[model samples]
Structure formats: structure tokens, C-alpha cells
Target chain A: APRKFFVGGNWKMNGDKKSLGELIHTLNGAKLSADTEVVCGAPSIYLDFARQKLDAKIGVAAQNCYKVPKGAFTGEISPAMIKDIGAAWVILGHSERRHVFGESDELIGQKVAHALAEGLGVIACIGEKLDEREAGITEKVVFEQTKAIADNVKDWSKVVLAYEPVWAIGTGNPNTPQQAQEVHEKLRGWLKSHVSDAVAQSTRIIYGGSVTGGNCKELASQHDVDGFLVGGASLKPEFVDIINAKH
Target chain B: APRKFFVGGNWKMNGDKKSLGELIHTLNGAKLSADTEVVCGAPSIYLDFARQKLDAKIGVAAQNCYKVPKGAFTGEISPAMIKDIGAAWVILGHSERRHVFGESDELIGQKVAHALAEGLGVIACIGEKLDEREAGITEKVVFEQTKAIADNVKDWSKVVLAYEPVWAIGTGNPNTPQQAQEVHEKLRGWLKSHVSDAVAQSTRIIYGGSVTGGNCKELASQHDVDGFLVGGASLKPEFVDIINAKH
Candidate 1:
């Protein structure tokens, strides 16, 4: 059983015309691994501009999406709308969505289900809060998040799990290989026991919190850790190195 | 007393790549009167794409914005981000922002001031609640909403005062020309009394409550109802008629 390696660059709220262009040029010219798949998220407003320059080999993503296809939800980008714009991947339930935008697990599951129906790929994010870790509920928190989406989504092949520990997000902190592997292994075990064996063996589980070139290799080397959903480093030259980490 | 007529289409939560291209085509080819100015409000995602297709004569607007230019506010588009993105106007304090997103008059005022300082034109929406109108507090409601911005922004030249009565916003119930005229007169008179004659005369006070081609002439004929901030009607072919309603 084989699944392609996944690497994502979550540019967040950063970059402008010249800089975004430069970043794209670097990726377009960089030496990427043959079996690795890559996607990048820009500010929603710039998705069209990014699309114009994007090559066929790399995929594009929206940072977030609303559950409903349309209505009066101002400032929300809907899954259908993102699909209409020709973006194939949408990153949902990210720490930003969970903490900053007040997204619930139920809401996340609904969005994942909706995106799946739209025939869009998803980088479904899952992780634990500092308090949850302190309470020794890291595995429980991660499991519940994954369970909600896995229960609803009819197809799991188009979805990649991005485990971003809430405490490490944007705080210049990252998970140790042991810590990340522990959660990833447990996630795999849960899938093997509860879900189809094929899915448990093949789903790529990517680590996200503060992944940079310096630390991405060790994380990528882990058995359960497949790749990364990089944050600030995604905006830099080092993002190329993270994409080619598998090589 | 020569205030330029400003007409803006608030295409809230609407349009995709093809429809947006058609809308731009409609705007580009329309025989608009020299006296009237037109700007189309785009969902945050389409601003840059729309900008490229639009000429310098027709303006563009963002449907919403955050008070600060940038920060940790996820899912919030900031004024600074749009400043360089080719959107000249921003619609703030609309009923959607007030009732839906919990944006208070204080926060609305802050956005108005910030957008103005960032050199972006603003279409500032002010309206009274149904109960407030029933309670004979229409003038008071309009005053608080208007005066907050007038206090922060000394220059009213770049502002289009959109008088969108909340009860009429998307509601099937339309405001009678009599009801709309009275409020417009009061808003103008209040500005004259509170600010200065130039401020009152220079600011374009636009009506925006279920305005359609059928009823636009009656509403536009009002002395103080200089133009409109059309909602649903703005998304239709009739939007051209509303823009040229003065005819």
C-alpha cells in the first residue's frame, strides 16, 4: 500500500504582489521530490492572482471555507465558491479556525463533509490544546477531532490529516519527534482498529505546527509522520527545503 | 452644493469567475451618465480579479473590513491589505455587520477612521432598527451612527453616506418614499447643523432599502436621496437602471 507524500505551505495573512510572485517562482524552479504532492495557501483575496501564476504540477488551497455553499455569511469563503474558483484543496479546522474563528468539531466535520461532496480535497487539521495535554488528554482530543470527520466523510482518500498541536501554533515552538510520533502512531492504531485497514495503512498524517527546513527532516523521517503543513517558514526561501524534505 | 452622485452595488455573497466576468463586462459597456459614479462591491476573494478587468473610471469596493490593517484576527480582512489591492471603497456599518457580526457603532467608527486614514474611500451605512423607528428614535439612531464617523473623519469628501434602514435591508418590506425622504432630510439637516454647510452639501446621502428599477425613480426623485447603495437589486441587470435612476 502506497500513498503520496504531502507538503503544504500555509502562508496565513502574509505576502503581497512582488513577494508572493518571488515565492511562487522559487517553488516553480525548486527541486521537488517525485512522489511528493504540494499545495500552498495564500490570503483568499490573492487566490486568483496566485492561480494565474501557478503551474499544473502544484495544487492550490484556500485557508478556510464556510459550511454552506452560499448565503449572507459575510467574509466567509464557501467550499462551492472555492471550487468554482478552481482551487482543489481547502485547509479546515486549522488552529486558526478552531481558536481564532471559534470553529467547533461538529462544524469542522460538517465542512469536511461538505467539501467532500463538492469533490474537493481537504487538509483536515487535528491537534491538542496545552490544557488538554496537561490533563493527559492529547490522544483523546486528537482522536475525537479525527473521529468526527472520519465518521462523516464517505471518502477519506482525498483527505490528509495535519496534526498541529494548538500550543505550538505560531509560538515558535514545535513538537518533538517522539511527541508527534506518539500521537501519529495512536491515530494510526485507532484507524486500524475502528476504520478500514486500507485507510489506516494509506492515509498520510502530516505535522503542522512551526515546521521549518531545520526540523522538517526528523519529523518527515518518523514512520507515521508523512510531511508538513508549515506556517511562517512557508513564506520564506526555506519553504522549498521543507517541500523536498523527503528527498 | 455640487455633490457628486455616488452609486455602489453591494454584491454581498454573490458571483463566481464567470458571473464576475459578465458583471465587469456589463459595467464596462454600459452607457453610464457622466454625473453618476459607480463602484461594485466584491467578496474579498474576487477583489483582485475584478480590479484587473475594471477600468480606472469605475471604482471597486470591499464588502467588509477589520478595524486594524493586520494582526491575529483570523478570517478578518483588514483595511491595509485592501489599500494596495485596488479596492478604493469599503462598505462599513451595514446592517449585516451590525446585527450579524456584532459590530457596534464604536467599532464601526474605528473602521471608518482607519479606512479613511489609509486613503480608501468609504461607503458608510447608517440605519435605525424597526423598533427604534417605531419608538420615534430614528433621528437619534441615525445621529449616533453618523456623528461617530463625522467626529473621527473631518473631511466628508471621500465618504458616501448610505442610509440603509435595517428593517428594509433584505426584508421584503419596502420603505415608502415618504419614510425615506423624511430620514434623508433629517440626516442632511443634522449634518448642516452639526458640521458645516459644505459638509452637508458635499456628502452624497444614498438610499438603500429594497431599491429596484420599479421603485428607484420615486426614491431617487427625493431632494436629499442623492443616490443608492443597492443590495439584491445590485446583483441583477436592473442595477444599471438604479445607477442611472436620476434619468
Candidate 2:
């Protein structure tokens, strides 16, 4: 088998306490595929509640985190704190973090290493800007981002690569299966070149960007594109379908 | 009776699962003074676990939060989420927030309004810097800071004003009782000027700045200084003594 089907939902500051329980309730009752691995990245404020409430089959990940155990960094979550609350995974280096919060490749790499050191898994996200893709630098852009982490963490076994094209993240325009496979195939080659063959073969390179019920199945069927790191559409009924796309 | 003694322990960016539970045990086992209204501001990561483990009398406050309920603001806690977790009080605009994280008075004022609207009580923190005190603007600076909050939050009953002098925060040089008293008096007057006489007479204006067991008793003795907003020392065993200073 290639990579096992993976589906992740980034609940980007959308749900609060009032609505979060129902969201978890939907996850609890939904027929999630056993062949697929599913996780949701929620805001830190709701992590403990999410941990306590979400079904045992589904795991939780924090949106963004600092590369430290704990200290004077105000308004930042730590790897230790996340682990303490039973969170097994963290999403790092998302496009929004790079563009909005000024997270550098070096910072993302450091975060990957730190989170792993503290024994938490990582969903390492990498994507190119539409212009980068237009300039024929899509592979090159993602190569640098992945190489940074591949060089440090040395273990891609616990990592998931989310290829979220910046243009399609919140915008409704998603990539056609061909468009997604091109970048994902090149990412596989980049991994083999920068690191080892096992990492290139085993690591999960998931897609993210306006992923909805309309497009999930075909995307899941792609040779190289293994799964999704869903956004806006993840907070809905379709999220269950996305999680069980393998079926 | 004069305003009841108030002591808040800000646990800053410290502690984890092991240490936090131990602290909860200490709090639950301690001899709490009936006259003191005790609360502890903890990092949001521990809010749920802390709420479950902490003594029924000890309230939990989020260290800081975003003014908006939710959306797109990454790495920030929200008042709605805090309230949803059943957190009753929040510490808005600490000096670390104002100086370190670039939180503005206008932004803090907005947070106060949001927290109150959510029906969560607030520890609305305000303070002056060393140069401002030296320039004879200590009272003026504190007054302006307090007035901004008074302008936004009409109801003062659910709010506790913490007067933390910036220079004295975490620094060894604690403020003199007389100096702290003058600022507290000004804050009390500012509340009276902007709100109503009933609010001014009853609202607690507490001191925070290198406050520890050493100076807590004398500061607690001040007529205007009704309580304390302890920082570094709040993590220590002496924190209990500071809470019981009213006796």
C-alpha cells in the first residue's frame, strides 16, 4: 500500500464552547473509516475540553505552538502543555503562520524539532504561493520548507505533510486532482533527494485548501495525494465524509 | 466594612501537570481566610484541569485573551471560550500584555467590555512606569489608564482594579505603602468621577508590584489599597500569607 488515507480538520478559530460539543458529538456518531487516520486541530482554549469530549478514535491537534517546554512567552502554547493535556499532535508552519505571524522556515524547523523532543507528533504543513506556482517554482518552494524539517527531526514517520496552496485555503477554488498530484509527486521526489527513501515512501503528504464534499473522493483516489488537512468545510457534516474518504 | 481583602496569584508561564496538581493540593489544604477573595490567573492550557482540581473557593482567570469572540486571530484565547469553560474571571491587559505584547489601552478597554458582556468577571489591570512616577505623572498616568476602562465598562461591580507599577513588577524594589496608597486613591477617585459613587465606595482597587509576604501586611493596611495582584511571589508558599493578610 502507498500512504494510508489521512484526514485532518483545522478548526481555525471557528468553534467556541457553545458549539464545540455538538461538533465533537458529530464526530462521535459518524462512521469514520478505520483504514483512515483522522484528527482535528482546535484552538488551545478548547483543547482540554476537546480531549475530554472527543471520541477515542479521533485525535486532537493544536493550531500553532511555541518551540519551548514553557516560559515567558505570553499568548503562546507550549509542547509540554499540549502533551500534558493529552494532545498527541500539533500543526506547524501553516501558510497563515508564515504569512500572518511571520513564521520563518528556520522557526518552523525549530518548532518541529522541539515538539518531537517533547514527544508530540507533528502535522508539518508546506505550500507555495499561487505566484510561486505560476513562476514554475512550486516544487522548489515546498522542497525548501520540507527539507528544513527533514534535516532536523530525521523522522518523518510521525509527521504529516499538508500541501495547502495559499490561494485555495479560504478561497473556494480547490486544485483539480491533477494539480494536487503534480505537487505531491514532486514533494515525494524532494523527500527522497533531501533525506532517505523510507521517509519519502512512508510519510503522509496530505492536501489542504478549500477541501469540501464536492472534491474529497477524487483527491483521496490520487496516486500521490494521500489525504487532506481540511479548513472551513471541516466544521460541518461533510467532515465525516472527508475523514472516511478511503471507503 | 472597608473593601474586603483581595489577593490574586498570577502563575504566569509556569507549571505543568505534576506541579499544577501539587499546587492545587496546597490550595485545597490551606487555611483560607474568610475575609479574602482569592483568585489565581493561570495560563489557558491549564484552565480546565485547574478548574477541576482547584479548591472550590479559588477562582481561575485566564492570563489574557483576544477581544473578539472568535475568527482568524491565531494563538490568542477568546473571552467566549473562557466563559464557555465556566471561567468566571479574566485578567485583562497585564503590563506584560501592554508593554511586551503591544496591547493598547483602547484594545484592553474593548476586552473589558467583551468580558463583561460575556458575563465573566474581570480583573482589569492598570499601572504606571518608573519614569512616569518620577516625572510626577504617577497619579495622572494611573488616572488616565483607569479612565479608559471606566469609559468602556459601565458596571464596576464585577471588576477588580489591580494597580501594578511597571517598574516594581517582578523587580525587587517594591512600592512604599504611601506611594501605592496615593495611586489607589486616584484610581478610586477616577472610578467615582467616571462611574457612580456607589461603585467607587465598594469597588476594590488592589496593589500589584513585587508584592510578597514582606510588604503585603503594610500594603493591606492602607485604606485605599484594598488587596493585591501578586506576580513572581504568587507561585510561592508565601502567596498563602499574602491572601490571608487581611487577618
Candidate 3:
């Protein structure tokens, strides 16, 4: 299991150029661990700016892209456009897109397939909502969500699976290590059984939602939890500490 | 009612930077009508680039923006960021956003108000679907849509109403001058009666969906139709001819 400890900064719809530039400035100046892989999931308007301004080793990604290459899908960026701008990756199917925007399982599948096919790495996100978790269908919900994404992915090498339980993310209560581990472990086994042993071993199963400097080390300590798709905390200076949790 | 002619090129999930740059080069070099206001609705990723590269007179607009200033909305860009990047306008409520992406009247209304409050000009769009038209409720449908947008507008000077009948724009059929004028005139009346005399006279009522050079002059001849929101033709050299439809 040689999955590099991957940390992605999902800055979401926050930060202006001045603020974002400062965030990148701090990261560009910091002594980040060379062993871990880091990528910034920047807002679409700032994707090019982030790519141009951010450090070369630290990757940049669009928070989302359309299922197609381009044309008439107004307001959506495509994989070709993301690559054209020199951003190497895109984050698709984040819980916000699912819950807030009403993006479907079928659409997320199409997006993951199209993104990987166009040669951009994907941070494919999956999670159960508060209602689903309360109803005790966390595994069923995420398993089907995972299947939709996994069904589209042909190259596990170009994909990072993000488990961002909606319940853990915005409700002021983060997931405990055991809660995070239980899901990651099940997903790993699911991949081993349904996809391949190699995929199960190699795919980076990262947890998101409420990842912070305080909780990252304990979560990173979980054997199946390879890394994080960091959210709001990603914007702060403390993001540097979370990136170095592996050490 | 002396609203200036406006021709907005909705690049619409199309064009690489190279291709888009070439299109802008043609536009920047062309002898456009002095009376017309030309803006390019670029994909979100290129908003800043288009603003930087295009002629100062040739305005740049984002095809869409989020309802809020900034937030955890994963894929959306905000009007605040659009202005921060020096882009002065955003095209809200495009039929593509309304129909394809499932945006609602309530959502588009909020977007228009927020965009205007944030100091960006809005191309507030409204129109009927094929079904709505076939059922002969075009007036009812577009009137409601117009109310949703108009109800949110405190300043009519910065707003341009785009009547993009999804039925006319798609399905290989374009609206004729007679049909275009009918809707524009009715919408203008609705604005006069419901919004204000000042708004109805001051606001630019434009047509979209299958607009092109061959048809532009005839459509432009309609008294209520101030300009166009050009789609496929915007990406082509013929957009210059469409801009000159009044001449």
C-alpha cells in the first residue's frame, strides 16, 4: 500500500484573489512535507490564477467541471478547459453539489468518467447525509455513491476517493476516528471485493468534512484513512500543520 | 425607449483559450457599430483572462455566478469575485442555467438582485419552453418569469432583459421577427404595468436562441427588441454583422 498521503485544500467558494494569493503565499513559503501530495481545489474563476501563482509541486484543481468537453452547458467548465488552463485536476461530486444543487448519481458518474478520460485527475467525493446517517443507511448510501463513481473510473491511478460525510461536515460535530475509520475500512473492503485487490490497496481513501489541524493526525493515524480533502480549515495558516500530520 | 443595441456573445461551455482568443482578436479588430454595446459571455474559468485580453469597449461577462458573495457552494463563482477580477457584467438566468441545470425562478431572482447589489450589470433572462409555447401559455410563462426578475430589481438602468425562449433557441428552429417582437412588446408592457414606466422604457429587452447574421437585421427591426444575446453565432466572425444589424 504505497498510496501517498494526499491532502487537498477544498477552498470552496471562499476567498478573493487578494485573500487566496495570501493563502498560496503562505503555502509557497512553508516547509511542507515532501512525502505527501497536496492539491488546492480552487473556485472556477480563480483556477487559472491559483495554478499560475501557487507553487509548482503543490497541485491545483477546479472544484468542479461539466460532464462534457464543452458547448451550451452554460456556467460549467469542462475537463478540456481545466487542462487548457494548466490545472491538473478537478473535484467532482462534492456533497454540496449533491445536496445543494441536486446533482444526480448518473451525472456524477458521467463527470468522473469524462474527467479521467480527458486525462485530469479526479478527487471523486462521496458521503451520506445527516438523514441517511440518522436512518442507519450510511454504508448503503455511500456504497451506491461509491459504485456510481467506481463504475466510471478506469484508472485508479488518476483518482482519489474523498469520503466527506455531510453529517460530519457542517453540523458543528466532526466524525470521531472510529467513525471515519469504520467507513474507510468498509470502502477499502468494498473495492477489494467489487473492483480489484490492487485498487483497494492503492487508491487513496481520504476523509473530508471537518478535517482540521487538531483532528488530522488522529484521523491520519487510521490505517485505511490515507489522507484528507480538507475544507474550511484549508484556508487558514493551520492548513500547513494538517499537511504535515504524517510526520 | 432609446436603449442602445447590445450583442452579448455567450461562449457557452465552448472554446479553448486559443480559439476564444482568436475570436476575441477578430472582435477586437473588427469595425463594430459605434452605437452598439458588445459584451462577451465567457466561461467562468476565463472571466479574468477575457477582461484582460479583450478591448476595453468590448465588455466581458461571466455566463453565470452564484447567488451569494461567497460560501461552501462547491462549483459556483460569486458576483463579488466577478467584480474583483474586473469583469463588469454577469449573464444570469440563461435558459441553459434554467432548464439544463434546473435553476428556479426564485434562485434567478436572488441572483439578479445580488449581482446588481454587488455592482455588476445583469442580463436577466426569461422565456417559455416548447411545451409552454405549444400549450399557448407563452405570455403567462414569460410574464411570471419577468415578474420574478423585475420584482428583485431596484435599478433598471443596469439591467438588460433577455427573452431566450428555450423553444426558439433549441430544436433547430429560430424565432421570427414577428414572434420576437410580440414577446418583447408584451414583456415591455408587463414591465410598464408591473415594474415602472422608467424601467420599461430604460431597460434593454433583447432576444436570443438561434440569433445570427442572416436573421439579425429583421429581428433588430422590431421596436421593443433592443439587442441580442447571440449563442452559436457569437463564436463566429458573423457576430460583427449581428452587431451592425441596426445600421
Candidate 4:
């Protein structure tokens, strides 16, 4: 099975007009890999402005969107609204949202299902806490998170499973290639047994936890590591390097 | 002190390009009250576009914003970014957010402080649930909600307090004018004793929940009803009428 190498820039809650303009200029002019699919997450308020700066080849994503299409969910951008504004992807279930914002596994799954239904791509994030990893229940935590969406997802092709260990995200620490591949390989095996052989082979499980350009290549070298969901580096010029890692 | 009439259109999670375009055109063409301070909330994704379409005199608002200015919080927009995008206001702590999204009074208070520090006006929302209302503790609930930000707010003028009873938000069953005034007067009294006499006198305390053009005149007739924070009706042409309810 041939799965596309993918790279996504999770801008998170960062970037202003002056800096975003420069970053978009860099991406628009950079020599990125044609084989590696790239999607950049822009803060919801700046999606339109950011979309205007990007070239068609580079896709844009909303950092988050509501599970429903539209309603009285104040402060939430719906999947319909995200697509209407020209963003093709929505990054859901990130650690920050799961922990800081108190989004449960059930709600994240609903959002994944809704975003997919709305014809928007979803970077469905799954991860384990530091204590969970220390307790050696990493697989259990990962499975619970994945299963929440596995039953809800109607299409596997539009979903990108991101494995971001909560301990590694923004701590400037990251999982070693061996540590990350161990989990990814297990998840891929689970997908085969639980979902389908076809899905296991086709699904792109990306790694996200302090992934800088320097380490992206080695991570991208692993068979189970399909791509990356980048954080802090996504706002910098080096984000182009991570996107072109396959080259 | 003469309170300038304030009317805010809470667009919630609704609207698309076509409908938003039409709505903006309608607002841009309408004859509004020169004295009323008008602010319209657009889904975060369409805010930039809405800002472009809106007249300079009419202000634009974000439905919600994060407590921090930036970083690592995926799917969340920061107050700094909202202001940077040219939005003048952010509707925080609405009943939808408090009830539907589980925003705690503490979290909402933090968001209010952060948004105001970012130089954006905050429409801080507070209200009681139907159960609480039936229990006759509406005043207590409102007091707790308001006190969440009273200590943190530096300038009361930058904050517009929106009292929206959760029961009245979208059920088409609003608090009767007298009922709304009862809560408003009690809240005003609380602000005078707990917050400040200046704040109680000058800060606009607006009513929300199923407000419409026909009923707005009666609500506006109350001396304590400074203005309104409209929901479903905000998406319609009658929002203009509600803005001019004091006319």
C-alpha cells in the first residue's frame, strides 16, 4: 500500500499578521517535496488572512472546529464554517485541548466524525500522559483514545492519526525514534486487527512532540512513521525543512 | 450618568460566506442609532471577512478567545490574535460557553482579564440555569459569576456585562421585562456594593436570551436595562431594530 508522506504545521495559538505574513512567504517560496503533503494550521481568526497568503499547493487548516456544522455554540467555529473559509483541515484532540481545555475523548471523537462528514480532513490526535507512560499503560491510553474515533470515523482516508505524548509536547523533550516507532507499530497492528487490514496499511499515523526540522528526518525514516504534526517549529522558517523531510 | 445604549449581535456558530455577505450588506446599509454602541459577533473563521465588510462605525467581535495571548493551545484563538485581526470586542463567558462548553467561572474570569489586557473590550456574560432560577437563587448565581472578574477587572468601562438567563437564551421563552429588570437591578446593586459605585453606575448591564425586535422596546424601557445581547435574532435583519430599541 502506498500512503502519502504527510507533514502538518500546528501553529497552535501563535502568530501575528507581521510574523504570519513572513512565514507564509517562506512556505510559498520554499522548495518543498512534491510527494510530501503539507497542511498548515492557522488560528481560526486568521485563517482567511493566512489562506490569502498561501499558494494553492500548500493547504491550510483550522486549529480547531466545533463538532456541529453551525449553531449557538458561542466561541466555536463549526466544520462547515472552517471549510467555507477555505481551510481543508482541522487539527483536533491536541493535548492542550484535551488537558488544558478539558475536552474528553468522547467529544474529540465527535469532532473528528463531524469534520470528516463535512468534507474536511482531520488530524485526530491521540496520546498518553507522562504518568500513564510511567505506569506502562501507554498502549491502554492510546487504544482508548483511538477507539473513541475508530467507531465514529466513516472514512479512514481523510483522517490522519497523530501520536503526541503529552509529556513531550512543549516540554522541549521528545520520544526517541525507537520509543515512538514502538508505539506506532503497535497502533498499526491494532488498526489491522480492530479496523481492517486495508485501513492499517493505508492510515497515516504521524508523530508530534517537539518535532524540529533536525529530528524530523530520522523520525520520517521509520516505516510506521508516516509524517509529523509539528508545533513551535511550525511558526518558524525551519517548518519548510520538516515539510521537505522526505526529499 | 447617561448610559449609552449598547446592542450586540451574538452570531454564535452560524453563517457562511453567502449569508454573511448578505448580512454585512444589510447592516452596512441600515440606518442605526447614532448613540447606540453596536458590536456584532462573527464566527472566528469569518471575522476578518466580516470586518472588511462592516462599516468603520460598526464594531466586530469574536465569539470567544483563549485566556493566554499565545502558544501550544491548538484549536484555540488568543485574545492578542483577536485584537491583531482588528476585532474590537470578544464575547466571553456566555451561557452557551458556560453550560455547553463547560467554561468555569474561574476560566471565564481569566479569559476576561486576558482579553481586556490585550486591549479588546470584553462582553462578559453571566446568568443562572433554569434549575437555579426555579430555586430562586438567580441573584446569588449572578453575583458569584460577576465576582469572578470583579477583582481582576482594572477598568469597568471596557467591560460590558451581559446577563443572559440560560433558560431564556434560545428557547423563545425570555424573561419578562419585569423579571429581567429584577435580575438587572439586583446585579447593579451587587456591583455597587461589591465592585464599586462608579462601576455600578457606568458599566452597561445588558439583557440576553431570545431577544427580538418586537419585544426589545419593552425591555429597553426599563431604566436598569442598558441594552441587549441578542441571540437567534442577531442573524436576522431585525438585529438593526434591536440596536435602535431605545429610538
lDDT (10s digit) by residue, model 4, range A1-247: 6889999999898888899998999889898888988999998888988788899888898888888888888888888888877889989898888898889998998898889989999998999999999999999999999999797887898999999999899888988889999999999998999999999999999999999888888988988999999999998888888987767
Scored by lDDT, model 3 comes in at: 0.91
Question: What would the per-residue lDDT of candidate 1 be over residues B1-247, giving only the tens digit for each residue?
Answer: 5667778888887778798889888878888888889888888888887788877788889888877766444456777778768778899888787876567888889889989988889999999889999999899989999998787786788898999888898886777888889999999999899999888888899998888989988888888888888888877889888888888
The list of candidate 4 runs beyond 4 A from truth reads none
Chain A alone, TM-score per model: 0.97, 0.97, 0.98, 0.98
Ranking, TM-score, top scorer first:
3, 4, 1, 2
True lDDT of residue A48, candidate 4: 82
Q: Write candidate 1's Cα lDDT for A1-247 as tens digits.
A: 6767889888877767787898899888887877889998777887767777877688888888877776665566777778777788888888877875567899889889988888889999999889999999888889999998898778788999999998888777899988899888999898888788888898999998878889888888899998899888888889888888877
| Candidate 1: segments with Cα more than 4 A from true spot | A135-144, A189-195, B67-76, B101-110, B128-154, B185-198
Which ten residues in a row are the worst by lDDT in model 3 chain A? Answer: A167-176
Q: Which ten residues in a row have the lowest lDDT in candidate 2 chain B?
A: B67-76
lDDT of each: 0.84, 0.84, 0.91, 0.90
Q: Backbone clash tally for model 4? A: 1
**A130-229 per-residue lDDT for model 3 (tens digits):** 8888899999999999999999988899899999999777555778889999999999999999999999999999998788888899999998999998
Candidate 3 clash pair list: none
Find the 10 residues in a row with the least total lDDT in model 3 chain B.
B167-176
In candidate 2, position B75 carries an lDDT of 62
Q: Write the per-residue lDDT of candidate 3 for residues B1-247, one digit (tens) a residue.
A: 5789888988899988899889989999998999999989999899988998899999889999989998888998999999998999999899988888899999999999899999999998888888899899999999999899988899889999999999777455778899999999999999999988888888899999898899899999999999999888898999999999988
Instruction: Give the clashing residue pairs of candidate 1, or none.
Output: none
* Clash count for each candidate, listed in order shown: 0, 0, 0, 1
TM-score of each: 0.89, 0.84, 0.99, 0.98
Scored by TM-score, the top model is 3
DockQ in order = 0.42, 0.40, 0.86, 0.86
Candidate 4 lDDT over residue span B136-177, tens digit each: 888889999999977679988889999999989899999899
